Structure formats: C-alpha cells, structure tokens
Amino acid sequence: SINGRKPSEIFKAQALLYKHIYAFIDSMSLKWAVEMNIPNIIQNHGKPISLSNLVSILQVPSSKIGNVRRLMRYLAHNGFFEIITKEEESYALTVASELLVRGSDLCLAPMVECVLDPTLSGSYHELKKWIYEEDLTLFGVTLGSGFWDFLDKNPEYNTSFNDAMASDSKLINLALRDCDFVFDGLESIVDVGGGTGTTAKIICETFPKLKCIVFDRPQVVENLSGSNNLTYVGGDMFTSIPNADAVLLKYILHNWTDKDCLRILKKCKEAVTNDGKRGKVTIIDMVIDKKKDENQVTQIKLLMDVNMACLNGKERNEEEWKKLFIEAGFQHYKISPLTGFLSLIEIYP
Amino acid sequence: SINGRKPSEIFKAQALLYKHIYAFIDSMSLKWAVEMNIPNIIQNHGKPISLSNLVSILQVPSSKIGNVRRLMRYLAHNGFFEIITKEEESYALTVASELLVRGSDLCLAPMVECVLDPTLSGSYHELKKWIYEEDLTLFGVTLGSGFWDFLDKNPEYNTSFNDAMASDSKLINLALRDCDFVFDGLESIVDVGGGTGTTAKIICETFPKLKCIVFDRPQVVENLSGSNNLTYVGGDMFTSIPNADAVLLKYILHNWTDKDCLRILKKCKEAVTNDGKRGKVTIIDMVIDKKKDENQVTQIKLLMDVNMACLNGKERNEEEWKKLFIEAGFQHYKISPLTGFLSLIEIYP
Ligand SMILES: Nc1ncnc2c1ncn2[C@@H]1O[C@H](CSCC[C@H](N)C(=O)O)[C@@H](O)[C@H]1O
Ligand SMILES: Nc1ncnc2c1ncn2[C@@H]1O[C@H](CSCC[C@H](N)C(=O)O)[C@@H](O)[C@H]1O
Ligand SMILES: O=S(=O)(O)CCCNC(CO)(CO)CO
Ligand SMILES: O=S(=O)(O)CCCNC(CO)(CO)CO
Numbered sequence A, B: 001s002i003n004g005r006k007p008s009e010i011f012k013a014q015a016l017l018y019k020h021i022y023a024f025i026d027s028m029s030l031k032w033a034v035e036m037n038i039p040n041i042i043q044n045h046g047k048p049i050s051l052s053n054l055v056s057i058l059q060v061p062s063s064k065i066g067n068v069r070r071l072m073r074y075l076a077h078n079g080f081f082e083i084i085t086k087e088e089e090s091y092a093l094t095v096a097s098e099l100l101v102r103g104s105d106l107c108l109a110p111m112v113e114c115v116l117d118p119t120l121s122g123s124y125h126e127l128k129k130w131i132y133e134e135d136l137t138l139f140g141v142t143l144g145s146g147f148w149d150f151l152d153k154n155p156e157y158n159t160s161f162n163d164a165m166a167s168d169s170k171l172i173n174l175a176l177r178d179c180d181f182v183f184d185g186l187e188s189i190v191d192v193g194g195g196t197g198t199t200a201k202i203i204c205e206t207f208p209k210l211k212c213i214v215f216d217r218p219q220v221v222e223n224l225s226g227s228n229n230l231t232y233v234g235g236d237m238f239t240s241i242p243n244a245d246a247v248l249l250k251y252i253l254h255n256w257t258d259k260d261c262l263r264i265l266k267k268c269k270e271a272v273t274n275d276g277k278r279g280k281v282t283i284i285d286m287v288i289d290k291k292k293d294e295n296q297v298t299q300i301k302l303l304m305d306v307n308m309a310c311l312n313g314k315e316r317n318e319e320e321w322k323k324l325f326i327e328a329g330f331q332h333y334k335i336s337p338l339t340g341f342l343s344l345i346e347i348y349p
Helices: A007-021 A024-035 A038-045 A051-058 A062-077 A109-115 A118-131 A138-143 A147-153 A155-167 A169-177 A198-206 A258-271 A295-311 A318-327 B007-021 B024-035 B038-045 B051-058 B062-077 B109-115 B118-131 B138-143 B147-153 B155-167 B169-177 B198-206 B258-271 B295-311 B318-327
Strands: A081-085 A089-093 A188-192 A211-216 A230-234 A246-250 A280-288 A332-339 A342-348 B081-085 B089-093 B188-192 B211-216 B230-234 B246-250 B280-288 B332-339 B342-348
Touching: A007 B024, A007 B109, A007 B295, A024 A038, A024 A062, A024 A109, A024 B007, A024 B024, A024 B118, A024 B295, A038 A051, A038 A089, A051 A062, A051 A089, A062 A081, A062 A089, A062 B118, A062 B295, A109 A118, A109 A155, A109 B007, A118 A138, A118 A295, A118 B024, A118 B062, A118 B118, A138 A147, A138 A295, A147 A155, A155 A169, A169 A198, A169 A332, A169 A342, A188 A198, A188 A258, A198 A211, A198 A230, A246 A258, A258 A280, A258 A318, A280 A295, A280 A318, A295 B007, A295 B024, A295 B062, A318 A332, B024 B038, B024 B062, B024 B109, B038 B051, B038 B089, B051 B062, B051 B089, B062 B081, B062 B089, B109 B118, B109 B155, B118 B138, B118 B295, B138 B147, B138 B295, B147 B155, B155 B169, B169 B198, B169 B332, B169 B342, B188 B198, B188 B258, B198 B211, B198 B230, B246 B258, B258 B280, B258 B318, B280 B295, B280 B318, B318 B332
Parallel strands: A188 A211, A188 A246, A211 A230, A246 A280, B188 B211, B188 B246, B211 B230, B246 B280
Antiparallel strands: A081 A089, A280 A342, A332 A342, B081 B089, B280 B342, B332 B342
C-alpha cells in the first residue's frame, strides 16, 4: 500500500493531480492557436485543412512540424478542432473554434488574448500575497496601481481590454435593446461606466427620442463626440453620477467588493431620485443560481467568480444581490434572464 | 441564429471556450493551496477543518475570508477537498490532497511548486515564438540559455528541480530494484544522468556487490562522495559514458529530440560493448499506448508530451521508441510496466 491506499487508487489520484498541475497548458495551447491565426486559416481554406497545407501556410520550420501536429491533436481532443482522416490527417473547425473566427456575430478571440496576457494572467501566481492583503486587489498587488489607473498609463493594455469588452457587446446590447420593459416611458438614461458608448449607440439607434449620457472616467471619454441625443460625460461614479430617469450598470458591479458596490449604488440612487423623481437602476451581470442553472453553466459562473480576484470582484447569487439592494435602500428588485451567462436586474428606490 | 447556429448551441460552445481560457485558474488555485500549507494544516488538525478554524490558523485578514471560502469550494469541486456540512462548513482531505501532505510515501507537493514557478510555467506564453525556432527549446527561448546551464547558474531553481525529481523517486526506485530481471548477472551499472545518486543508492542498498557509477554533469556531482561500490563521475553523456555491464536511463530520453536521443543512445551502446562485451541499456520513461492504456491515463501521457515542449522532448509510443532503437543499432527491445505512468524498457545491442 501507498499513503495508506491501494497503488491503483494512488495512480488515479496522481492522474487527477497532474491534470490540475498542468491545466495551464489548456489555456496556453488555446492562446497559441489564436496567435497562430489557425481558426481564420481554416475558415479561409473553406474545408478541413491537411497538416501539410497548415504548416505550409504557417511557414514553420520542418523541425517543429511534429510539434504543430501534437498541439493540434491536443486542441482537437479539447473540442476546438475535429480531426478528419483520409490520405492525410485534416483539421476542421467546431462551434467552439468558430467563436474564434474574425467577423462572426460572436468572435471571442480578443477575450482569449486579453485574459491570457502574460502579465495579467501571471498575476494569479500571487494569490498567496493577495489573500494576505487587507485592501489590495490581485491586480493591485502585481501591477503596482489600481487596474483603471494602469489602463490609463498603458495604451496597448487599454486597447486589449476595450477589444475584449467589445467582443460580446453586440449580443448583449441587442438583447438589452429588445427589452421594452426597460425602456418604456424613459426620457433619459445614464450608462454608468459606459465605456466608449458601445451600448449607448445601440440604445440611441433603437430609441431615437431617448436622451443617453455615456458616463465614464475622463480619460476614457476624452475626445469622444456625441450626436443628437447621445452625449459623453467624464466623471467618477463614486462622487457624482448625472441625473437621469434610469441608470444602466453593464458589467460594472461584478468588478467591486460589496462595500464599493454600496457606494456606487448610493450614487445611482441619488441620480434617479433628484427633484422628487423616482427612477430606477438597471444592472447587467451574472446571477449565480445553483438550483436552477444547468450544472455546466453554474460551474463557469463559479469559475468567473474565482477569476474576479483580479479586482476583488464577485459574481453574485440572488441572496447576495438582494442584500446589497436592501443595504443600499432600494425597495424591491426583479431579475430576468437576458442572454447566455447574463441576467438583467432592475432595482427600484 | 448566431454564427449560423441556435443560440443554445452557441451558449454551450461559449461555456467550453471559457473553461479553457480560464483553465490556468485550476493550476493557480492548486499552487495557492500548497503555498498556504493547507493540506498539512488539515492533516495536522486530525479531522475536517472548519472555515473559521482554517482562517484562524492562516491569519488572513477578515476582508479576505470569503475569498478563502471561494477558493476552497473551487478546489473541493475539483477533487482536492471534501466539504462536510454540519453547524459549519468543514474541509477534509481526499486521496489527491493526501499526495500533498509532507512525509507521505508519495508527496508530490514539490512537483506542484517547481512546475508552477512563474518563470518556468510563464514560458508557455511563448509557444508561438518557439514554434518558429529551428533549434531552440521552449525554455531556451525564455531563459536565454539551455535548461541545464540555467540550473547551474540559479541554485534556487536547481534545488526546486531536484526536489521535484525526488518527489516520486522512492516509488520508482523501489519498483526498479524489485526487477530481478534487470540486475541478474550484472557486475556493474552506470546510471547515466543519475543526478545526486538517489536511484544508485537504492540499487547499492539492494545489491551490495554491484558496482554502481552515478554519471552526470560535473556541477551536479561535484562534492558528492561515494561509498564502497558507489562512485560519482562527472561528464557529458554526448561525449563519453563510462564502461559498464549496463546503462540506466531514468527520466533522460523524454527530455530530448529524436536526434539527440540517437546521440545519447550511440554513446550508451559504446559503453556497453567495450572489449568484446555485449551488455544492455535499461530505460525508465513513459510509453504511450492508446490501444491498451485506460483513456484517462493516455490523456495524461499526451498532456505530458505537450508539456515537454520545454526541452523539445517527447513522450513516446512503442513505434517511436522502436524506430530510435533500430536507428541507434540495437537488435531488439522489451517493454514491461514498472509503476503508474512509467515503463521499463530494455534494449540489446
Ligand atoms: N470611478 C469610476 N467612474 C466611472 N466609471 C468607472 C470608474 N471606475 C471604473 N469605471 C469604468 O467601469 C467600466 C467597467 S468595464 C464595463 C464597460 C461597459 N459598461 C461595457 O459593458 O463594455 C470601464 O469602462 C471603467 O472605465
Ligand atoms: N550532457 C549531459 N550529460 C550527463 N547528464 C546530463 C546531461 N544533460 C543533462 N543531464 C542530466 O540528465 C538528468 C535529467 S533529470 C533525471 C535525473 C535522474 N535520473 C532522476 O531520475 O532523478 C539531470 O540530472 C541532468 O543533469
Ligand atoms: O480604480 S483604481 O483602483 O484603478 C483607481 C482608484 C479609484 N478610486 C475610487 C475612489 O472612490 C474607487 O475606489 C474612485 O475614484
Ligand atoms: O543542455 S543545455 O542546453 O542546458 C546546454 C548545452 C549542452 N550541449 C550538449 C552538446 O552535445 C547537448 O546538446 C551536451 O554538452
């Protein structure tokens, strides 16, 4: 016996341990496929590509052709390619690698590249130091400033981040604009942390009479010009949010601790309750629901929750969301499914 | 439809993509558990540990207790802890986390730490540059020298590596010494790339009449002193291997390309065929066998094969091994299972 167990039981446990020690290879191989432009090469080929044609296009040295084959077979087994064998081995796209093809409705390749930046993803080697920090975020530990300040000083990172945020924007924004219950009766809305206006443009295109303010950090909105009913305001959501009939928070609250979310939600409440008005706040973020979601979906949401250590953020379940809303002085809330992993939450002051 | 597919099909593919983009979190969370000494804490506790007692021992700030809980639940779901719920949530070890407990027959925690070094594991961000190198290894790209030269210049790395190699040594070495077919009739053996003599000591303890030479790089064996029939020789296996009745190659050939393995095997053949003798070479390494191994085992071996990009190495199947042996001028070979992932291969000149 080994470790008080049958050798066969130990071998099974060793296999599990190795799967996890080496899990980073799943990430790194996927990154490599995107960096080598393989999904687009195959799409452009118009049929499954032979290994010989693939390496010919890539112009890899002959000494590394077998390494390409090994990586392709590894990716295929993970579900990113289909191997078809005739005279030669060939590689076809799958639905998952079709998500990496430029100029698709949903092209998520920019998310792969942003998340797997060596410095950002490398930050996760410092979970131990981070867990001992009373206040710092994981990125605060590794980058030497807060994340938003870091983006302001590093334009290539700012671009990578913006592209990653844009990569699922059409789908979410279109699902949002199709929610008439959100926009019925509004005369104005402020998109708090609204970025470069990606969401707001779709809103304005849908509802040409609606006043829309894109609100974000001064550096984010500097030099952007609005049109007719769309304007940009630079500011700090922790200090003052412009008055409107409604606030939108898309992918905002999951970036912050409960304490910081409280501060934001207080400013949002103020924005929608000026001069006797009683507006509302509309939130787009994940809602964890272990009882109702499919297990695989719950698992991804739990993973994202762990990933949010980067900003001391959180992916919240309904009880967690409710506790925030009550502490922030909102009277009631409603949660609806929106698209994929995301819900639409409305709160009423 | 999205990307020519039903939205539900796209959501399933998105979940797969996210699993892989974020796979590195599996590695990083495991590393964190080891760095925080959690498996040992639980072992020493003697029963499953409550979250409150765990965080008390760790002395984490109160603001990060929930983060500990989230990480523990993530690790538990992966199989490294069992959650037991009564008045509180508590965490028990599993067979897999028992592999991380100091002073077990098989303690693999040093392997977790060596593999997941930020610089070594971070090298895998450079698969693209590496694939375009005619000669360089992945570590050669990122470390700016060959790996063995790097260890010679960086003692903390050399220590980490040695500890990682030691972590499964007892099991393998004991399985080896129990193979009487290997040692029957030998008067001498040279352990080529034999390290600090870990294997050779077990051999000599088992077979006190057998002459054993531990052969490795000068820096590795400098200052080591042998006893009775165990000696150390510093050298270069690419240039000259000391004469003996047999050569052992434990975890050697998987570190090299086919071309380099040929060079090594030629020197091994020379070592066992001096002065009319006809000895043999004994190899300990993985043998991939998709037809015969359990699928989960094959998957780990294929993963290790991908991982060996670090040194342009390879985990070989039987046809691959055979082609090397034939090209190196050996007449016949035999493969036997040894322990866990490893086989024992004997080749005859
Ligand atoms: N103090 C602050 N005030 C206003 N915006 C802030 C802020 N701190 C961060 N942000 C903004 O919060 C956003 C989070 S990313 C989400 C952006 C956008 N709603 C989208 O869906 O693409 C960024 O644009 C960031 O600049
Ligand atoms: N040119 C060379 N000549 C001799 N040994 C070499 C070598 N290049 C690398 N090595 C050795 O090959 C070994 C690979 S690691 C395996 C070590 C040992 N057999 C064990 O099982 O623990 C290292 O000890 C390394 O120093
Ligand atoms: O968000 S960063 O950490 O990059 C910069 C600090 C921002 N501070 C706030 C203070 O209220 C929020 O913590 C906003 O100005
Ligand atoms: O192995 S390293 O890359 O760290 C150093 C180079 C060793 N060169 C050899 C030449 O025969 C093998 O490639 C051995 O001296």
